[PDB]
Amino acid sequence: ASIAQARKLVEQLKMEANIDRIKVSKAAADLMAYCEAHAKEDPLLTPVPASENPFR
Template sequence: MSSKPHSANTIAHTRRMVQQLRIEAGIDRIKVSKASADLMNYCSDHARNDPLLMGIPASDNPFKDKKTCTILHVLVLFTETIDPSTARPLATDETWLHGF
């Protein structure tokens, strides 16, 4: 009595396996050399449209900052007015503020 359910499961499993093998046998296959050549040709033909290869123009890039950071701009202007040899300001007036 215990062998009947086991054989029914085996038959169902075998039928599913045969069905899957028939599906796989019906698939048209090509050689790896042809598939790789086709893939290389596709990549070459579409490379000019790939933003990872060609980059994104700054005008079209939504993630590019439109303005510079004001604090960094002030620091750059301030350091340009310092004499590197003495670490003192080049002028006594506030010339570094004239950039604003």
């Protein structure tokens, strides 16, 4: 009973052990590249002019 539930935790930690963790600088540069590449179509980053805005 105690081993039947505790093995299910440590098996999940075993599966999360062998994860190929790319370094944080590389994922940071990935996120930076995504946010700079998608920065034109964003309607919150720049304010939209009153023509295209369907509310006012």
